[PDB]
Amino acid sequence: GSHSMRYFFTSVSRPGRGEPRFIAVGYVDDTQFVRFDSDAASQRMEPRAPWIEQEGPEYWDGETRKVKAHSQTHRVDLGTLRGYYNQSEAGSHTVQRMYGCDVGSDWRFLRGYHQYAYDGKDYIALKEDLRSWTAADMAAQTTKHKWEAAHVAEQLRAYLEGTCVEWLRRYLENGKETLQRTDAPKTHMTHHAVSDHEATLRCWALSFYPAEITLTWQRDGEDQTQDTELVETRPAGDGTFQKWVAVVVPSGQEQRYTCHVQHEGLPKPLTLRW
Amino acid sequence: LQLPQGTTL
Amino acid sequence: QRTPKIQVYSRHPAENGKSNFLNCYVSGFHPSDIEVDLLKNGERIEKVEHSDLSFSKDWSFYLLYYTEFTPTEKDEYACRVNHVTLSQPKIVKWDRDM
């Protein structure tokens, strides 16, 4: 199936004293593999997956150098944005950046991303063609003119279509034992009586990887969304994911209801009944 | 592997 | 400013007297500053770890807080969350059925 590599970066200004709190994380699909935290003692990019530990001290030097440079870019940005938005030196603000690439089942380039937010709102994003920018407001428009003049999009396109895809392929091969393994959801159904006339059926999906999954309910073979509750997919903490979907039913009519599970690790979707 | 060069806003 | 969504749950299906991991997943919030505690019979648990801050496509943040735990019939577990969007800390009780 499809694969991705993504890096996420957050800086939060500290107006009273010093530099922003900066946290950077890198992922392959739904597996974190690197991190940097400005509050941590090491001041190095650190491994978070066994397969990246195969990389030499040169990799760790280069990645630490880039990530510390990124922290400085965010520090300068927080200052520039305070100016663009006529804000006081007294409040804490946040800058967030995410970039990366998507590849299909053939591991060939599918899509590239490079986007920025200020205080949780869109600021500037590279468009899908990797040639132009979406600037949300006039402050971001001044950034867009600066980046067009310096041909920033061309540099990003080369990394996104090239380097990003090339290194994603490397990690997929190196971490094949886990990265290329799909973990099908372990499913079961629970039943909870609310009164003598109402019951809740809860369909569980546990221990799956990747995180993408669909859980749906049917009544007599027809889709049922009314009287259903679906929780957000959540991490188990061991690298896998969990989700549940519940339906409220009249007591005694449990047999009409079926839960349907779709996941990459299941050749055909699963059906569960009470 | 991260992007080799950065750019400020 | 976006309020956090909270889920409190065990890593494995719960059984009284059997070793497990208690999670508190906080998501959909902005700004990133948040206080999260795991509670055992209303008292803050000390050995609690958390994931590195990351965020979704819509820019909202998410974190996982976790610790080892052994559920019982009578011990209560909960997650206590404070954030700029909340006037009082929000307490979500752990229920093995959710």
3-state secondary structure A132-148: CEEECCHHHHHHHHHHH
Whether the CB of C61 is below 8 Å from some CB of chain A: the reply is yes
Do both A143 and A247 map to the same domain?
no
C41, C36, C94, C86: which is closest to C65 by C-alpha?
C36
Structure tokens at A105: 């089942």
Q: Judge whether A3 is annotated as a binding position.
A: no
Give how far the C-alpha of residue A70 lies from the chain's centroid of Cα atoms, to the nearest Å. Answer: 19
- Give which of A155, A161, A165, A171 to mutate to test B binding, by max B Cβ within 10 Å: A155
Q: Is C32 exposed, middle or buried (0-12, 13-18, 19+ CB in 10 A)?
A: buried
Interchain pair A152, B9: CB under 8 A: no
Question: Facing residues of B3 across strands?
Answer: none
Interchain pair B7, A76: CB under 8 A: no
- Name the residue of chain C whose CA is nearest to A33's CA: C52
Task: Residue C66: list chain A partners with CB under 8 A.
Answer: 237
CB A191 within 8 A of CB A274: yes
Q: In this structure, which long-range contacts are made by residues A184-191, counting pairs with CB atoms below 8 Å and at least 24 apart in sequence?
A: A184/A208, A184/A263, A184/A265, A184/A266, A185/A213, A185/A243, A185/A261, A185/A263, A185/A265, A185/A266, A185/A270, A187/A259, A187/A261, A187/A270, A187/A272, A188/A272, A189/A259, A189/A272, A189/A273, A189/A274, A190/C97, A191/A254, A191/A274
Q: Judge whether A173 is annotated as a binding position.
A: no
Per the structure, the count of domains in chain A is 2
Question: Facing residues of A230 across strands?
Answer: A245
Do both A229 and A126 map to the same domain?
no
CB neighbourhood size of A210 (10 A): 21
- Angle among Cα A121, C61, A6 to the nearest 5 degrees reads 85
Do both A150 and A194 map to the same domain?
no
Do both A29 and A160 map to the same domain?
yes
Whether the CB of C13 is below 8 Å from some CB of chain A: the reply is yes
Domain final position from A116, A151, A181? A181
Experimental determination technique? X-ray
Q: Is C19 exposed, middle or buried (0-12, 13-18, 19+ CB in 10 A)?
A: exposed
User: At a CB cut-off of 8 Å and minimum separation 6, what does A55 contact?
Assistant: A47
Q: Is A256 exposed, middle or buried (0-12, 13-18, 19+ CB in 10 A)?
A: middle
Whether the CB of A16 is below 8 Å from some CB of chain C: the reply is no
Listed resolution, Å: 1.5
A240, A208, A235: which is closest to C49 by C-alpha?
A235
Per the structure, the count of domains in chain C is 1
Task: Residue C33: list chain A partners with CB under 8 A.
Answer: 12, 92
Of the partner residues A92, A192, A235, the one whose CB lies closest to the CB of residue C25: A235
Task: Residue A147: list chain B partners with CB under 8 A.
Answer: 7
Amino acid at A102: D
Question: Which residue range forms the structural domain that includes residue A89?
Answer: 1-181
Do both A177 and A195 map to the same domain?
no
Report how far residue A244's alpha carbon sits from residue A26's, in angstroms, rounded to the nearest whole number: 28
Do both A113 and A162 map to the same domain?
yes
Do both A228 and A250 map to the same domain?
yes
Do both A190 and A142 map to the same domain?
no
CB A188 within 8 A of CB A136: no
Do both A27 and A114 map to the same domain?
yes
Question: Which residue range forms the structural domain that includes residue C85?
Answer: 1-98
Do both A34 and A165 map to the same domain?
yes
